[PDB]
UniProtKB/Swiss-Prot annotation:
Subunit architecture: Homooligomer. Interacts with non-structural protein 5A. Interacts with host VAPB. Interacts with host PRK2/PKN2. Interacts with host HNRNPA1 and SEPT6; these interactions facilitate viral replication. Part of the replication complex composed of NS2, NS3, NS4A, NS4B, NS5A and the RNA-directed RNA polymerase.
Portion of the full-length sequence here: 2443 to 3005 of 3033
Cofactor dependency: Mg(2+)
Protein name, UniProt field: RNA-directed RNA polymerase
High-level lineage: Viruses, Riboviria, Orthornavirae, Kitrinoviricota, Flasuviricetes
Highest rank taxon of the organism: Viruses
Annotated positions of the Phosphoserine modification: 29, 42
Function: RNA-dependent RNA polymerase that performs primer-template recognition and RNA synthesis during viral replication. Initiates RNA transcription/replication at a flavin adenine dinucleotide (FAD), resulting in a 5'- FAD cap on viral RNAs. In this way, recognition of viral 5' RNA by host pattern recognition receptors can be bypassed, thereby evading activation of antiviral pathways.
Organism expressing this protein natively: Hepatitis C virus genotype 2b (isolate HC-J8) (HCV)
Description of post-translational modifications: The N-terminus is phosphorylated by host PRK2/PKN2.
Regulation: Activity is up-regulated by PRK2/PKN2-mediated phosphorylation.
Domain RdRp catalytic: 209-327
UniProt topology in membrane: Single-pass type IV membrane protein
Length: 558
């Protein structure tokens, strides 16, 4: 069947869409080449619609069958419950798309009687009607990048009333099921440092390691109606209340497996027969379907002793090299099997024999030294897109701050420590808003953090070593240097000059601001302080930050 059919109505915007980074002194200080920065808009939505629209043919085999059977047997051990309406309401992001039935996220969150009664109505209708397709909206995402222009991604999502109902039915399953069926392979359980440890231990376990990442072309489009019904059968293998069973079946048949799409002006735009990117189960579902297909393909291809890390559509596999030519052959074989299972490639996979060169979720492992001279490994990535988004968000504030998420995930990197932290601590000081909670996205969910708690957050996630790394790798330094030159950013030496002042300003503000100055900016001074463990970091519970997200990142914790 076709992933999509289109009536010919356009994908339309809601309000104005800015395409270009404005020329402003506050963003110019970070990077000067503003003409290189763009935002995707609905103007390119038809280009993306072309790419995501195609016929799927899937042919399954004995290798897929055995993996699936193992998975359902593992799902047998999970038991789950429904959420109360109040619990699902608390999971709703404060800036989530409003409902067409007269209320928005603020009303959901405050438990307004209108919103609550509406959501009870939606729930009752899912219990009663297990077949009528549910309406969705299709929109073009506005995301910022640097010219290397890519067309906008498309997001398809149901009404806010429906989205709360999905959480009520599937949030508890989502907390339990992935780990129970995939164990260590489920990648969203790991904090950055735990991801690093996983990969280092997997790579180290092989006599002659080989790794590869597999890039599925438009993974959501390749998910078939059968794949989605199979996901359902996995959720039903759990021990669930009958009411949950019914609603899961209804959401599957009415929403997950496909349905009509409307544009922002209320015109019928098309019909979907593939994964919706803005449904609660998008991340759990993609992770499960990827895992199953991937593990079956390893077995088809003769990959020897695979260790997989699956995060939604992103897959990495580390295994025993069988020789240069035979690895090449085996990856071609793995590709043919994936292609049979309806997960055809974008970039072809290639065997990699150096761990630093393996990319999982746009990230890689790198090494440096801490202040005691010990080798420490950390997660890093190419800093282009983070610095470009940081520049855009400096001038156009977003309800969700990508730069904060980058600080937290990538704190031990040179580019976070020297560029992002310096730039944003200066801004916070100028605004006098150091002590104000901000929202950010981590692993498909939205969280709230106070910048003044960053040192304990970082120590907890990355250790005290994160404040003292030095002697970074030439791969890493080359990449940071190349980004600064591409974007026209100041050189690292200039960021050090700036940071010395930010550090002083922080120390003079006292209290928690001074801990931020002393720990976050120890790298900036000649006579380094001896940093000791922060008592608060030892008491922090941050596990909750690393879960499967929701589709469109439409879930909010705390």
């Amino acid at each position: 069947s076709m992933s999509y059919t289109w009536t010919g109505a356009l994908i339309t915007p809601c309000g104005p869409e800015e395409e270009k980074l404005p020329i402003n002194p506050l963003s110019n200080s970070l990077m000067r080449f503003h003409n290189k920065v763009y935002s995707t808009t609905s103007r390119s939505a038809s280009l993306r619609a072309k790419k995501v629209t195609f016929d799927r043919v899937q042919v399954l085999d004995a290798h897929y069958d055995s993996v699936l059977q193992d998975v359902k047997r593992a799902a047998s051990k999970v038991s789950a419950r429904l959420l109360t309406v109040e619990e699902a309401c608390a999971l709703t992001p404060p800036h989530s798309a409003k409902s067409r039935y007269g209320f928005g996220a603020k009303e959901v969150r405050s438990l307004s009687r209108r919103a609550v009664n509406h959501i009870r109505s939606v729930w009752e209708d899912l219990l009663e009607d297990q077949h009528t397709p549910i309406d969705t909206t299709i929109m073009a995402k506005n995301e910022v990048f640097c010219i290397d222009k890519k067309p906008a991604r498309l997001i398809v999502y149901p009404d806010l009333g429906v989205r709360v109902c999905e959480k009520m039915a599937l949030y508890d399953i989502a907390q339990k099921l992935p780990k129970a069926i995939m164990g260590p392979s489920y990648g969203f359980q790991y904090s950055p440092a735990e991801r690093v440890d996983f990969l280092l231990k997997a790579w180290g376990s092989k006599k002659d390691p080989m790794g590869f990442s597999y890039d599925t072309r438009c993974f959501d489009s390749t998910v078939t109606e059968r794949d989605i019904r199979t996901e359902e059968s996995i959720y039903q293998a759990c021990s669930l209340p009958q009411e949950a069973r019914t609603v899961i079946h209804s959401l599957t048949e009415r929403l997950y497996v496909g349905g009509p799409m409307t544009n922002s002006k209320g015109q019928s735009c098309g019909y979907r027969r593939c994964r919706a990117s803005g449904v609660f189960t998008t991340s759990m579902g993609n992770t499960m379907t990827c895992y199953i297909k991937a593990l079956a393909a390893c077995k088809a291809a003769g990959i020897v002793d695979p260790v997989m890390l699956v995060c939604g559509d992103d897959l990495v596999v580390i295994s025993e090299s069988q020789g240069n030519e035979e690895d090449e052959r085996n990856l071609r074989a793995f590709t043919e099997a994936m292609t049979r299972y309806s997960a055809p490639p974008g970039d072809l996979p290639r065997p990699e024999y150096d761990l630093e060169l393996i990319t999982s979720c746009s990230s890689n492992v790198s090494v440096a030294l801490d202040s005691r001279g010990r080798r420490r490994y950390f997660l890093t990535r190419d800093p282009t897109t983070p610095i470009t988004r940081a520049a855009w968000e400096t001038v156009r504030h977003s309800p969700v701050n990508s730069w904060l998420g980058n600080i937290i995930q990538y704190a031990p990197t040179i580019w976070v420590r020297m560029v992002i932290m310096t730039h944003f601590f200066s801004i916070l000081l100028a605004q006098d808003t150091l002590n104000q909670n901000l929202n950010f996205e981590m692993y498909g969910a939205v969280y709230s953090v106070n910048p003044l708690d960053l040192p304990a957050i970082i120590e907890r996630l990355h250790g005290l070593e994160a404040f003292s790394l030095h002697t970074y790798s030439p791969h890493e330094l080359s990449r940071v240097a190349a980004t600064l030159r591409k974007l026209g950013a100041p050189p690292l030496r200039a960021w050090k000059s700036r940071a010395r002042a930010v550090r002083a300003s922080l120390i003079a503000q006292g209290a928690r601001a001074a801990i931020c100055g002393r720990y976050l900016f120890n790298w900036a001074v000649k006579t380094k302080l001896k940093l000791t463990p922060l008592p608060e970091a030892s008491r922090l519970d941050l596990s909750g930050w690393f879960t499967v997200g929701a589709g469109g990142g439409d879930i909010y914790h705390s």
